[PDB]
Amino acid sequence: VPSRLVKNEHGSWQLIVNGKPFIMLAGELHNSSASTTEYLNSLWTSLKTLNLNTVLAPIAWEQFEPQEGIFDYTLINNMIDGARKNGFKLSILWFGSWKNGESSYAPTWVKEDTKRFFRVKSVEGKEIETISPFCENAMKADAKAFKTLVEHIKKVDQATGTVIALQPENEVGIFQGMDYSKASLAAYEQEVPQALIQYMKKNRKNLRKELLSVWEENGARTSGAWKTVFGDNAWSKSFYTTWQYATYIDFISAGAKEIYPLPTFCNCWLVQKPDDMPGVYPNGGPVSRVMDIWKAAAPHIDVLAPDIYLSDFKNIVADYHRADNPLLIPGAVMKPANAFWAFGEHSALCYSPFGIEDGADNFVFAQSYKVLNELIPLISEHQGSDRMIGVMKMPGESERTVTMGDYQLCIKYDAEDAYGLIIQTGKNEFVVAGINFKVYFTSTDKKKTGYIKQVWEGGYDTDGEWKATRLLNGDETYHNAVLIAKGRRTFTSEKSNNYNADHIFVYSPTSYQAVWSPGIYRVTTYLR
Amino acid sequence: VPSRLVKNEHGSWQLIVNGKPFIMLAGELHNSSASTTEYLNSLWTSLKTLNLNTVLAPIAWEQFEPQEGIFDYTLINNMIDGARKNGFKLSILWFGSWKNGESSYAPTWVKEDTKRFFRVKSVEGKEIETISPFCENAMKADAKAFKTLVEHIKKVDQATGTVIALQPENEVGIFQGMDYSKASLAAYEQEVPQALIQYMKKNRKNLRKELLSVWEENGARTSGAWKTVFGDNAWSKSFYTTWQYATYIDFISAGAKEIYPLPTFCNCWLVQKPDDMPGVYPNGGPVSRVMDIWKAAAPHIDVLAPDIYLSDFKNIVADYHRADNPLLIPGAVMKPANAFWAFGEHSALCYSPFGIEDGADNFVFAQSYKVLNELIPLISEHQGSDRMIGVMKMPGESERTVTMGDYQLCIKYDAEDAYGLIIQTGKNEFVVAGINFKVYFTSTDKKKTGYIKQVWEGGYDTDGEWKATRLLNGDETYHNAVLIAKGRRTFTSEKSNNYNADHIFVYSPTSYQAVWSPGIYRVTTYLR
C-alpha cells in the first residue's frame, strides 16, 4: 500500500506516503462540489493557489451505486485524474449510510425500501430520514458498496498512491437520546459486549472520565445488561448507540482493509457546549466523550477525527489527541494559526479548512501552507518529541514561557493574530516559524548567561535545502536581544507615504503598504 | 403567416412563431430611439447583452408617410435588417393617430388640416393636440397608412417572420370626461350599438362589474340611447368614448388583417389610483374597466395589453388576464421578479421593460432572461396548466403554500427580492427556477410522509437538453430537508476576506464577493 500509518521513535504516528513522511496540508470541498466532473474540474486552479498538498473530496453512495449492483466510476476516476494532473493527494470521503447524522446520500433504492432498510424512529414513533444503525441490511449494502469503491481505487491507484486515506461516513449519529426502532429497543436490553468490558478493564487508568464515572457509579460491573452496567440514563443510551455505530462502521471498514488497507478515519460533530446531552450533537459519533467505546468497537478505524469550527481550538485539539489517537482535523476554519498549532504542538497528520475552494486568493493562508510545506521534513523529524511546540495567542494572553534544553524561551505576542511553531534542532539551535511574536532566549541555569548568537531568515528550496535570505542583526534583532518573527513581506500596490521618525528607536520609512505571512528563522544560541 | 395565436389543450393562448411556441423576452425602446437608422443601429449590441429575444420598436406615421401618398420605408427596412442581424424578433408599434392620448406623431399634413382632421375639444371649447376619434377622415387616413406598412412587412418578411406582432396606436384616450367636438356630442345621443348589447347579454357572467352594474342600475335595457341604457354620468361618457376608440382602431386593424393577419394588441395607460375617474387616465384606452367594450367593438384586436409601472404588480396582472385575454405586458419596469410572475403564474406571452436600451448593465436582469430562455419549451408546455405557478414575494409576505398533486409545497422567502417559478413535470418531479426562496415538500395525504428524493442544479443547453451542474445535497439542501433556490453565482473581482465561522451551521468561507441570479433546479420527491 502506498500510504500507511507508522509510529516513530517518539511514539508519534506518522503518515508514510510513497516511502516518505507526509503531512496533509489539506482542504475539504463543499459537499456538492464533487457531484459532477465539470464542477470539480472548474476548481483545481483555485485549489493550487492555496498550496494544498491534499484535497478531501466525497464520493456519494447515491451516485456511485445508482441502482443496486450497478456502479458508476465516473466521479472517482475523474477525481483521481484531476488530482494527479494538479499535484494533489486525495482523502476520499464516503458519504454512505450517514452524513451529518442523516441518510440523504443513500441511494434512491435504499431510501425507497423502508421495509428492508428500516429508519430510526423518534420518541413519537415517526420514521426519520436516517437509516437505523441497527439495520444490518443497510450495513451490508453500505459495506459492499464501500469495498467495491476501494477495490477500484486499488486497481487504478495502488502503484501511484494518489489516494492516501479514507473517511467512511461523515459525522454520524442521531439527534435523539436513542433510536426508538424496535431493534434499537431490543438492543438496549442486551448484555454489554465483552469486547467493551475487556477494553474498559485493560485501559481502566486511561478511560475517559465520562465513561469511567458512569461505569463506577453502577459498581464497575464486568457483566450484565447495558442498564445494569451503566444505569438507565442518557449516558447508557449514548453508549449502546455509540457501540452500534462504531460496530456497523467497523464492518464497512474491515471489508476494505482486507483487500487494500489505507489509513482510515471517522469524523465527529463536536459536543458544542459542555452541558450538551447526546442528541443535541449526533449521538453515536466519535466525540471524545465516547472515544473508548469507538476504540473498543472499531479496530479497523485508525483515527477519530474532530471537525472543529469553534473558537476554543487549543483545548479541543488537546481533548482529541491521545497516545492511541493522532490529531487529524478534516473540517475546520480557514485560519493559519490553527494549522501551526495543530502541526507544531500536537504533531497533527492533517489540517483541512472546510469549503476550501471558495477561499482562493486567501493570500496569508496560502503563504502559510507554503511555509508549512517547506517545513514538512523537519516537523516530521520532530513529531512526538519535546523539541517541538506550537505558538498561538488566544484573546487576553500576552506570553508563553517554555524550557527547551539549556534555554528558557519567552514568547511575547505583538498582535492579536500571533502564531507559529518552534523546533529545537540542536543543543544550541532553533528553527522558529510564524508571525507577530518575539522570542527572548535566556539560560535555564542561572550561573550562566544565555544569548542569541546569530539569526538567519530564510526557507527551504525545492530540494529541501535551507537557503538564507538575510542574516538578521542590528535593528532586525534589537542587536540580538531578541528574535522578531516579523514574517515574510509582500508590498502591495497601495501608497503608504510613511517617512516620519516614530519615537527602542528604529527608522523604517515606507513607501508602500505591505502584507505579511509566516517566516522561517534559524537561531543559534550560546551560553557563557 | 409566420406568427399566430393558438389556444393549447389547457385553453391558454400561445404565440406560435415559425411553427414553435414562442414567449417574448422583450424590451421596448425609448420612444425616439428608432427615429433614425444610426441611432437605432447604435443600440443592437446593448440589447444583445440583455438576452432579449424580441424588441418592441415604433414606426411613426409622421415619418412613414411624410407627405400624403408618399411612403418612406427606410426605418422599417433598417429595423428588420438589424433585428435579423442581431437575432431578435420585432413587435412593431404603430405611432399613428394617438400615442399617450395625443396626436404628436400624426404627419405634418394631418396636423395642419384641422378642417379635414378635426380635433378633440375641451369643456372650455379649446381644440387640443389630439385628433378626435369621431373623425372618420383620420380613421381612414391612419388605416390606409397602417395597411401600407403591413403590406410592406408581408412583402419583405412573410417567409422569415422577424415581425411577430403589431400594436396599433399607443395608450389611446382623452384626458377628459368626454370629447366636446360637435361629432362627439352627436354620438352620445345615438342608440347603443346592438353589438354591445348582444355582447353584454351573452357574456354577462364574465362582464366587468364596472359595466354590468351601470347597465343593471339602468334596467339592463336591450335598446335605447347611451344615456338611456347607461344613465347620464361619467361612465356612460366613458363607454361611448371607448366604443368609439375601439371601433376606429378595429377598422385600422381590420385592413391589415385582411392582407396579413399578425397577432395584434392595444396597450393601456392604467387607472393609476382606485378613485380615478375617466380622463385622469386616457379615457378610451383598454383599461380593464372597459375591456368588455373593447372586446365587443374590436374583434380584429387580439389582446388588451397593460403597461405596468406601478408596484401592485400581482393584483394588476390578475385584473388583465382573462379567458379571452392572455397576459401581454409591452411596457414595464426592469425587474426580474415581475417577469417570472407574469410568465409562471399567468402564462404571459410578453414581458417588456420600457427604455430597455438604457439597462444594458443590468447583470441580474440579463441572467434572468438567460434562464427564462432556457425554460421557454417547458413554460410553453405548461401554459394554463395547474402544474405551473409563479413565485414572487411582496412586502410583508412570508410564504406561499400550494398543493401540487400528491405534494404540498411551502415556499419561504429568504430575502426581500425573492422570485421564480415552479413546474410539476411529473407525479414525483418538479422544476424550480429563481432565487432567494426555499421550498419544503410534504405529502398531501396525511398518512404518508413526503420528502425530497434528490436535487440537481443545472440548465438547458443550446439544444434544449437538461445539463446538471451539481447534485445538490448535504449543506446545499440541509440534507434534503429543503430546496434552496440560492441562484447561479458569479464571483466579482471585489475582495470579501470572509473566513470566520458564523454561528443550521454551514461553513462558507469566501475570498471574493459574489452576485447571484436565478437558478434552475430539478427536484425528485417520494412518499414512504
Author numbering:
A (entry chain B), B (entry chain A): 20 to 522, 526 to 550
Give sentences copied directly from the paper behind this entry.
In this study, we identify a β-galactosidase with novel substrate specificity from Bacteroides xylanisolvens, an intestinal bacterium. The gene encoding the Bxy_22780 protein in the GH35 family is a component of a gene cluster containing SusC-like and SusD-like proteins. In this study, we found that Bxy_22780 specifically hydrolyzes β-1,2-galactooligosaccharides. We propose β-1,2-galactooligosaccharide galactohydrolase as a systematic name and β-1,2-galactosidase as an accepted name for Bxy_22780.
To learn more about the binding modes of the natural substrates determined above, the ligand-free enzyme structure of the E350G mutant and the complex structures of the WT enzyme with galactose and methyl β-galactopyranoside (MeβGal) were determined at resolutions of 1.91, 1.86, and 1.94 Å, respectively. All the structures in this study were tetramers based on PISA server analysis, although the asymmetric units of these structures were found to contain two, one, and four molecules, respectively. The three overall structures were almost the same except that a loop region (insertion 2, residues 506–539) was visible in the ligand-free structure. The reactions using the E350G mutant (a nucleophile mutant) were performed in the presence of various monosaccharides as acceptors and α-d-galactosyl fluoride (α-GalF) as a donor. Reaction products after the reactions for 3 h were detected only when galactose and d-fucose were present as acceptors. The pure β-1,2-galactobiose (β-1,2-Gal2) and β-1,2-galactotriose (β-1,2-Gal3) produced by the E350G mutant were used to investigate the substrate specificity of wild-type (WT) Bxy_22780. Furthermore, the E350G mutant used for a glycosynthase did not show activity when xylose was provided as an acceptor.
